Symmetry: D3
Subunit: 258 residues, 6 copies
């Protein structure tokens, strides 16, 4: 009978693989997926928000850049408790939605649904920074090390090799990380970081030019950082501090422009 109390913040990385698919995807998301979602989980989800992605930056393709948005949930219980499988009303969800997001063509790309605890486990740079300090270019990135790579070795590489370069860049204002909760849904990702910049240029200097300094790992799946396969072992997005799509509080139906 007992359902465990399990506060988590989860992230889904939502791509759009053609600009021709965008109107339709965005339609589905806002006209259909929102009300289905709320209808199901209003009683045990405290927050449901979309953070629309900034335009893909140069070489964003290599970071598995989600060209549509990030979907953020805050959970009081595990969505993967199997007792939750049962829904009186199920979502409306055509095959097409996967085509649009890139999960299948018409291999594709996996669906990345990452669970984290609600507060960051590590604060590595920018402790104490307020909203009055200014507008942020928030690059959220999640990585998963390829098959047969020691998780401790990946971590050592991450925090003793990658992060230090972010700490050295004055153009990087904030670094946060949390370990992915793998027991929840067997997400392949192991880490979620958020790295902040003043703007797109800042982002480029650090994640492309500064990282050229890095040594190509033995397990490297691409040539340059992040050395992980785009959309499979690395997804990301750049977002603003604010989103008007805080959905449990603000959604009033699919109102159309006149």
């Amino acid at each position: 009978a007992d359902f465990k109390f399990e506060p988590m913040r989860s992230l889904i990385y939502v791509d759009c693989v053609s600009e021709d698919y965008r109107p339709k995807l965005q339609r589905w998301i806002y006209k259909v997926h929102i009300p289905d979602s709320i209808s199901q989980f209003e009683p045990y989800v405290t927050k449901y928000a979309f953070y629309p992605s900034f335009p893909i930056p140069p070489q964003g393709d290599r970071f598995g850049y989600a060209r549509m948005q990030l979907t953020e949930h805050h959970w009081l219980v595990s969505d993967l408790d199997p007792r939750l499988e049962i829904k009186a009303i199920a979502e409306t969800f055509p095959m097409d939605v996967l085509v649009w997001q890139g999960q299948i063509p018409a291999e594709g790309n996996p669906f990345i649904f990452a669970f984290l605890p609600m507060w960051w486990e590590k604060d590595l740079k920018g402790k104490g920074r307020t909203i009055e300090d200014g507008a942020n270019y928030r690059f959220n990135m999640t990585i998963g090390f390829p098959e047969g790579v020691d998780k401790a070795e990946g971590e050592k590489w991450l925090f003793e090799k990658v992060v230090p370069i972010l700490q050295a860049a004055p153009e990087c204002t904030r670094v946060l990380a949390s370990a992915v909760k793998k027991d929840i849904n067997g997400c392949v990702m192991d880490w979620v970081l958020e790295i902040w910049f003043e703007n797109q240029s800042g982002w480029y200097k650090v994640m492309v030019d500064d990282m050229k300094a890095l040594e190509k790992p033995s397990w490297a799946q691409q040539d340059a950082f992040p050395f992980l396969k785009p959309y499979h072992n690395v997804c990301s997005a750049a977002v603003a501090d604010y989103t008007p799509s805080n959905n449990l509080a603000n959604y009033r139906g699919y109102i159309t422009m006149r």
Copy 2:
């Protein structure tokens, strides 16, 4: 002392035993009861809603049909924890509310308030159905087998005898069930089912005529299905898929018509 995380969904079957009582009962509910209620449980109830009952279908008097509404709470802790008995402000509660609901006559019917897990336990027909598939006539029935009936003999009857008639009838779109949490407020009921149709006529056809086929149990409290004493061992409502009285989000005070 700790308070247990006990997420639940509860349902109250709120009758109205005379049309001349309707404006008064209804007034009290929407003008007084909502504010008192929200004031008390806002911090530990995630959803408070009323689902107004469709008008009483033929023979529904035999199923304990709640002529006013279904009342639905979603809890984070148990309302029956004795520490919750203390409140700064008690509900304003005129004794006439009990007359209006048929609790006393000015013999009377018991206050039915069933606790459940937030997710249905059994999914027996229509798995996969979405809102895109059309409007449902949702028939919510709760039952409690009489004193001195084996609960398992009754469980067995319910699911090996009754449910299959529902499964067989093309007029029924959906059958969900969940056992009543009996350890919370000694509710006399043992089960809650929601059984969907397309309309009142289909409900009648399946729940009256198809049910004729059932042999009458030895414990039967009336001659035909549900075989239980209306308002006492069976209550029910038929309701829409949508209610606009989702009270934590949409209550704006008792705004009077002009």
Copy 3:
């Protein structure tokens, strides 16, 4: 490009001609028609609400009782301006809705869509001036009439206010009587008057609008034998409604959230 300030309150009498249709009709209303309607007029309507019907009272059918709802708009401009015909997005409107509402039969006779415009404020207050919401719950009988073809309007008017109303006035069972003339200029609505007449309950409504009204002389223009002497759903429509509705749509709509 000059638009008339034209504040008004309109009422639509929505019926549901069979219980089997109600789920489908109610769905459409709250799932489809609200958002389309809001999308269209949000900038020049200040309120937009539905008041569900209490269940149909006895002999309620002879009053053109709307078994679904009153739909109420407050406008700042006339919706029947021809410039307002054009809209980027048009209503999603299945033919079936006309079946559900009774406007056409299904495969015995079709009832018109009644859409009546009024001033925002009641024109005549004929009983119960000063009654507050503290005075108790109201059973609100909202009723619109339109005298049939060939009857002098002034004669009808005088009959309404010198014959019918004084019975409402006499009856202690009736707490309130309000009336307004229908703005007929706007959209040629067949109705001439709208009244709201209040009781404590259905029992009260019946005693007055049925039994007290038996004393009324049958008019020569009468379309049925007893008050209101007008053809149901064609020359009289009505509903009985509560003081409050949770369906104040501009303030309170959150999308079509489904029960679990």
Copy 4:
């Protein structure tokens, strides 16, 4: 016939003549008045708000200081058009409210309900100031010259004698004024002004000490500025930039503390 478009902002100056009345007056205002008011004008009043008064400063009694609030309305039609007299449901108004606000005595104070254009007619000091410039002590004052006093002679006094001193005082950051629309409801007041300060000390220095320099006019009803009979020909309140009681958008019923 036509209803004229008439966009106006009204102010009402709500006193509370004793601290033992504050709980009852406030309860009536926020529990009964709001929803009676909203119910009536929701369709033709675009905004309805209360600005609680700041604690009455020294000598504020002499300015006819509202110890409850200012009550602001924005109208699209004149509330005084006779046809607006008729209303389904009447304001619930017990006589005590008059006692609480001092309309009827323990002599009475009149009820001061002044109509204005929605935009200030005169901007006399501090045009250009934004909210970024800091928190304002907003002293809203209405005055009405007494019977017999020539309206123009008074206007000239106000603008050529009184204002100049506000303009000299660097403690005052803003002076706005508008003639009262007398022709709506025969309000006795002639002008409403808002005069801003950093804080109470500032309001004092300027509106008491600096004003001692003015000569006492022949028509004076008291010895010191404002020279007008308190609560009868002069009312005021000091209020903050922001109120949480923007009622048309924020009221969600009389929810009570636990």
Copy 5:
């Protein structure tokens, strides 16, 4: 004293001239502009909404493609009425914003703020279309014929040459147009059109490829359609059917992501 009822819908084409300015401009718009704006016009503006631009399509540069948003207002009175110039709280508006939007440079582009009646004046293709007919790529374009060009010539060319190509394209689902109200704020534009396609490729086929057919007029400010100077004599944006930024209804302050 009288104020004309002047219902109208207006549009601002908000560009953003470099991806490095986006965070800052976004922030200001949503953190500062919204609350300043609402404070000011809540009582006489019934709708205030932002529709963020879709990703600039190929050759959008040539259409004065606003890279940030359309800002949409619905007014009950004319903002240009000189009595509305007086405000108590002036908007916080550093000149930096004019740099982000491109009004001022490192040539300045003008600020295009076009007034219109609330309902489209010409329905030219696809009358009858509902939301159910599918998602729309909505291309809003405003054009101003350059100095010296007879205005009727301008119109004659628009509706006799340009629109028939839109009508001929099955890729184009809707054509709407309204004349700009010049008499309000001397906006240099003469027309606004919304032209719908299914997606970017449909938009490209018609607005770029099909238009090659048009004859270059004698006043052309650029070799190909729209034959007008970008951002000066033509602005445009492509937007979705829905926006979450319906600000009078949905703003709950500047909430930051966690």
Copy 6:
């Protein structure tokens, strides 16, 4: 590790030490603090609310009367879990707020952010400057523990003057003796006063943030007059205990060992439901 379920109601006694600070402190509260706060805890706080103070009554000073407001949070986890010390965006929280609330004396440089080693906010709410008054931030269970007078009173029974008071017994005073005193000498006088309509009490959850206070009580009246008649005039009857930090009841050092506010039944500042941004007056 797991985060424990910990349903709690908490209160902060927010003072304003001079009227000239009021506009500034209010603006900061309403313009800056709310959004920062909501942003932080929206996913695990079910209710964030401000109950502004009624006017300070005669002799309120002696009860540590909070001249601005009560600040009420309802939590699903403990805000003092060390892991909640990490926040993407920290609170804009200048030192001025502490000057204005009386936590620290006036000085230059106070427009600056509070410099803490950990979080500026969590450490600001632990302020305990010798020359100021401490920051009183008391955690309670969500439901009142003891119901001592007035059980069953509804809102139809009338408007309430709700005097909310927290007290903590002085350094080295025996805690069980304080309790004994409170409930066998103080309460009885409340119970005897027909002018007191309600008495409610809960023990402060000390095991959370080290709050010095031991008790929170709410005591209802009809008005200032009745509040005074009972909390001042009736209370003269108490004997002065050996640990007394002032001559008269509550015998406790104001703003240090006693804090209080009187508030209404309703607030419009129920922040999770009602806040639409700092919308300014025209």
